[PDB]
Design a protein around this ligand. Sequence first.
Ligand SMILES: *[C@@H]1O[C@H](CO)[C@@H](O[C@@H]2O[C@H](CO)[C@@H](O[C@H]3O[C@H](CO)[C@@H](O)[C@H](O)[C@@H]3O)[C@H](O)[C@H]2NC(C)=O)[C@H](O)[C@H]1NC(C)=O
Ligand SMILES: *[C@@H]1O[C@H](CO)[C@@H](O[C@@H]2O[C@H](CO)[C@@H](O)[C@H](O)[C@H]2NC(C)=O)[C@H](O)[C@H]1NC(C)=O
Ligand code: NAG
Ligand code: NAG
Ligand code: MG
Lengths: 1162, 331
Amino acid sequence: SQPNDEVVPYSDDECTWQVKANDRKYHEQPHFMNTKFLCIKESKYANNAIKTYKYNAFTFIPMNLFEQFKRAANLYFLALLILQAVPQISTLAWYTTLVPLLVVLGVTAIKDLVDDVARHKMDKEINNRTCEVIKDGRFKVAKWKEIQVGDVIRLKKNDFVPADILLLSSSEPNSLCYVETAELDGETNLKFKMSLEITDQYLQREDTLATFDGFIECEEPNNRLDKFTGTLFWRNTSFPLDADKILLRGCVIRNTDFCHGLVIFAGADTKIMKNSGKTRFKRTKIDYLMNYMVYTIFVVLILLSAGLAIGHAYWEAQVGNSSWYLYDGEDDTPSYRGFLIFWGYIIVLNTMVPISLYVSVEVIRLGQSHFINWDLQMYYAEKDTPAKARTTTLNEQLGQIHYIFSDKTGTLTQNIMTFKKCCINGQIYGDHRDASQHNHNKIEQVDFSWNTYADGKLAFYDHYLIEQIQSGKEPEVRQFFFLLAVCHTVMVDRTDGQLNYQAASPDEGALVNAARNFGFAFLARTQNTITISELGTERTYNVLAILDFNSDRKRMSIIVRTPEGNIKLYCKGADTVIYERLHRMNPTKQETQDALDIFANETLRTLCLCYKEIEEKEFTEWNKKFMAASVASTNRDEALDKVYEEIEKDLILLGATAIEDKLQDGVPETISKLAKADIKIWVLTGDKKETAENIGFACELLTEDTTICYGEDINSLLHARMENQRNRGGVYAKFAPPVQESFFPPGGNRALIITGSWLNEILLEKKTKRNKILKLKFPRTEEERRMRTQSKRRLEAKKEQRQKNFVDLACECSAVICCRVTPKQKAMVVDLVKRYKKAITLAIGDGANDVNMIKTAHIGVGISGQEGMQAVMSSDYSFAQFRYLQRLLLVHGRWSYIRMCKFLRYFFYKNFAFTLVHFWYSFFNGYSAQTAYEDWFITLYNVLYTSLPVLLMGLLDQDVSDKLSLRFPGLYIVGQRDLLFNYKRFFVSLLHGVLTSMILFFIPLGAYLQTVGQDGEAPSDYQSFAVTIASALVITVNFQIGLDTSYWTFVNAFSIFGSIALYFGIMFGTASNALRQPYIWLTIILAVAVCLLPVVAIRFLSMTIWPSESDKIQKHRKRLKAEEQWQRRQQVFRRGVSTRRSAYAFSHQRGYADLISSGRSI
Amino acid sequence: KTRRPDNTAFKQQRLPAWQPILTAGTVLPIFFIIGLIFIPIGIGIFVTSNNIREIEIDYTGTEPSSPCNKCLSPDVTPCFCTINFTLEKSFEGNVFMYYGLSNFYQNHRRYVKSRDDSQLNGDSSALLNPSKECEPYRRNEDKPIAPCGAIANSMFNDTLELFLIGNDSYPIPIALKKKGIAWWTDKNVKFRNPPGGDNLEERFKGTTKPVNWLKPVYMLDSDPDNNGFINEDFIVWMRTAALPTFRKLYRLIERKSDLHPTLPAGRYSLNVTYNYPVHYFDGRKRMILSTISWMGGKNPFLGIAYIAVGSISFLLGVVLLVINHKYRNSS
Ligand SMILES: *[C@@H]1O[C@H](CO)[C@@H](O[C@@H]2O[C@H](CO)[C@@H](O[C@H]3O[C@H](CO)[C@@H](O)[C@H](O)[C@@H]3O)[C@H](O)[C@H]2NC(C)=O)[C@H](O)[C@H]1NC(C)=O
Ligand SMILES: *[C@@H]1O[C@H](CO)[C@@H](O[C@@H]2O[C@H](CO)[C@@H](O)[C@H](O)[C@H]2NC(C)=O)[C@H](O)[C@H]1NC(C)=O
Ligand SMILES: *[C@@H]1O[C@H](CO)[C@@H](O)[C@H](O)[C@H]1NC(C)=O
Ligand SMILES: *[C@@H]1O[C@H](CO)[C@@H](O)[C@H](O)[C@H]1NC(C)=O
Ligand SMILES: [Mg+2]
């Protein structure tokens, strides 16, 4: 049982569900419901509503306070609310220290509810989709939310399935419905669902659908997506069911008209909604930093208030009680005076980390999340989507991203095939002209004005190809294009004359439509014939066999008889398997392969075409063998294979084709910039292993000179690292260093293609059969000697070490692609990278299988604009194109980290230079805890005088423009190594605040120990000593915010000179008496210069010795050229030809030979 | 879905703005312009401050050698200790006479808040009912104190008299003025007598006298304008100090129209009615005579600070020019 690597291992991840047809009150019996503590009780059967919000009606208050108090500062403020209410040391009148705290909690709660109403509105656009339900009589319209288990609903074409329905009738012959699952598992091919044999022939009608006494005994909701073991108890010897008769939620009905079905599961019981789960509360990487700061400030505050309360004890018993003037009626001992003033110094020294922190952070983070959805250059004009920002709390983490995990189908690609070029007898066709007439003239697209069914859909440029099929001078060309219209499974569906193609493959409808644009149109097929009108003349071949496509056959073929009476075999398929079935007389066996090299050199997906004359006698001996094994019990799928290649030898080539897969407008050049900013990209997809390699070549993740290292290679390279070189493996080395170099020789660019089946083998995560252990854990099957086996597992030894080795190996692969992975294997991969080698991760994708990965990554993005919006509602940001990831990361991301690291640095300097003056003043008043400012200035400092200029900076500052911030993606690296602000740069903004609070006091103290005036108006009192310090503090801390801003708007300079003017203006007693004198206006000027002049001489000295890479860009902002690079990396050939890798890719299923069975036509 | 956003320059993050960069010729010539203004200003202060003439007496008699030692623990009628000081150089212009103290913590939190600003503002209602903040000195034997609080309790009450002995048997009583030594907004706005008639005995009816005082506030001075809460010696003490070592204005020594040395050269005697007990807590008392200037007082800290700041700043504009030149167009 080797890894199948084609199966999407949904594993290793009949219980009486009892739907019972209608019976809308059978499910309301009390023997099914669950009862809870209060009178409100739920049921076992869930409703069909979707809830993505967090606060419903009345859990908003208890829950939001819980995540409000997850910040260390909200405990800091509350503790002082209690400490300022004890009356012995209260220092306060009536409670004015609680309303400010409530208003702070009343701003973050209302910003977190405006955000959670838009999410409460997005769910309204799903639960109102109006799919028909049968109430009592006929069919009536009804919304998705009012659908319950056990309903008979009707669907139309191109409609979405609302719940897990059991198909029981349809409008197609034999009642089978076609459905695509591009939102469930990333596949682009259609998958037919065939109803039951008894329900099709009896219900089939609305009138008798209202009477259906059905019964189901299926299994339980188990996020399996491919099993569904259960039976249908209609009546009288019931019928069984299977996954072939189940339609899931995130599907889309296609190529039918209307179908009917029961409802087995609903809402959060469906098999897609059990794969997306465990939502969590996301907090950025700076939020864990703003916690360690408050934990350090609070420890410093306890020490200072305890070292200044000892001084008030020794002073109150040395100078304090001898002093008669300081007489108080109390009799407190000097050792109790010290205790009572320790709490007085926590009230005074508390206005560091002040209350206006989480108000001015959630105003900076609210105005930065509005620059994302006002962006006129992240707006997708075609579908009219504005690139909303949905979380408004994770902004600064966009500029710290390490890894990016993306989905392929629907995100990197736009699901278009567009037949590109072909090779017929060596020479390729469709370069630009490749002709004689109209060669050096313009390169206009050729006119299909000669075909009647042309419909002008295909885009072609080659004149020579289209004229050579009009002449008929080269016989071996019309034979090529006739084969494209014979070897397929398409269905034709004509309303009136105009013909459409109901192909159940994206890669097959591209070729058939390619043929029709060069004649050879496919008209119809009954059950045995195919009618084709090539170049006007219409002919009717008959079909003798169809050796259909398979996962491990890689080819499809047909045997036809021409109307003349000549039987032959047509065939198409891969290039590596036709080359072991072709005759050894072809002259073109090499020249076509040369085209295959060129087709595979570009990013195209190629097939080989061939045929063989079937003589006239070996057919009959084989036709007998074909019919013999066609019907069989068990050797009917694999022994018919032994007959399929009984006739494959002696094939002759015609050429090759080449289909493209349009990526998106600007995906490959987005990846180049992102990889240049040192971001690793992994592609986790659900599509086949060959299509994930084609896209990995188109978007330049893995170009030429890149060893691929498939999945079966990795499991061997990791067994030569663990099974050896630890303590065993032949000759012991006594060292066993797992650091030798890298797992790899130097040379880099070693991609890694891994399938989901191999990813469950490499990480030792599987499910084992039952027969591995004897019984349960109890003292009989295991002795009491410390539970030697059922408790000693030893799995956590290998498992944790095996996961650590894998992630260490993928650190140097330069490209990782994982394919055929379960929707919760994608989340597991995201979680191994953010556990070992901790990293900030992003996850972008669309569709219901990316919801689990979006919830697990640090930041989740969802592609919006299409009809499937499942992955948008669980995201954090949602634009519409992959190419907008440049601006979300390199403009809105690295600006938002610069602006938040400058607000924090300046917020802990303006508040340490203010609150720490009371520390130096304590040595000159007997450690009495008395304030060195007035009382109106303490309560107006961080509200009016210094609160605006940093807010207008945190919203408007920008390092370099948004035009050359994209051009130099290397500037992103500053915010990703934690260089601009960390725990070692937070201790420099305190040492810069203890030196400012020292100059601002000891310079005015030097000028006051002597006289400053004489006339008797002389201010030397305490009133004027608290105005000299206050007015030398507003001027200083409002100049250090002028040296910081490097982008001076007008409102950014009216807010600095409008805070100093608001101080000297509102203050004009002691105000009009100390500021009127020459000596006061010289202590202020000296104090400002001394504490502002050396912080310029460190910015200039640290800019011309170790300039940052953001400083060199500004110096040459006006001495640089332009650029228009990234064309395609033209790599025409190589001398070291070694790749010779097959570009084979084909999206199709097995078993589409419904045709030969009963001709599913009419 | 939410048609295109507007193109206004604020929403697109492209507001008009000035982008400043710290070049060579922007922060190099600011370390020199400051260096040529701070040194001249630092000499103007020092030279001006040097020519104010100042004398201190320090008449606290802690040492046995001082004549005022006979009144550290008195037990008799008020003392009178006399000190002889000499003005070796003359005083001209106007003269100010202060008194100084030391180890007096008038900025203590238990002492600063001990007043009642409503009462001192001539409030007819709270005069009979002082606030609780002055609790040690809020009430007396069923009578409230008119000047309430621990600040007005410990007012300075020493009396200083200056005599010019230019000839014996005639110590000249140098004239001292006691009016005009308070903030102009304290005598006319902040401190107001209660709104009564014209007898201060009736305005203060029923209110007692401060514990440590000797006469009620309605007889502090005989001038009917300068009496009560509007007293100027009282106002100056109420205006608390900022550091333990302070000085407060006492009297003015006016000059005369004829050009004379207001305090002429010669010997003088200071006649002191020692009352204020500062020696208990290591206090010190002083009497200070100073002259005026168009700049300020004898303040030499600013003079030295500007010379030191204006030179260190200058000697940074040089070491930021041998480094900018060396490290530009290079590593
Ligand atoms: C000048 O101010 C001095 C400020 O202390 C003041 O000294 C204080 O005088 C009062 C007299 O009312 C004393 O009060 C108490 O003294 C006696 C002890 O002899 C007690 O028994 C009484 O209860 C009385 O209330 C203060 O003790 C005394 N202060 C000190 C530190 O001893 C002078 O009296 C003032 N001189 C004047 C106004 O001329
Ligand atoms: C010095 O300390 C002593 C004792 O702590 C204080 O004396 C007490 O003062 C209260 C105030 O009325 C009286 O009720 C007690 O009876 C006093 N006890 C003693 C033993 O004297 C004193 O007030 C403090 N201050 C000084 C002396 O200035
Ligand atoms: C002032 O001087 C006189 C005589 O010089 C002497 O009684 C004492 O020192 C002082 N007397 C008074 C009343 O101030
Ligand atoms: C102070 O000077 C006076 C003259 O006015 C003199 O009588 C007295 O003895 C002197 N006392 C001292 C201690 O010098
Ligand atoms: Mg997808």
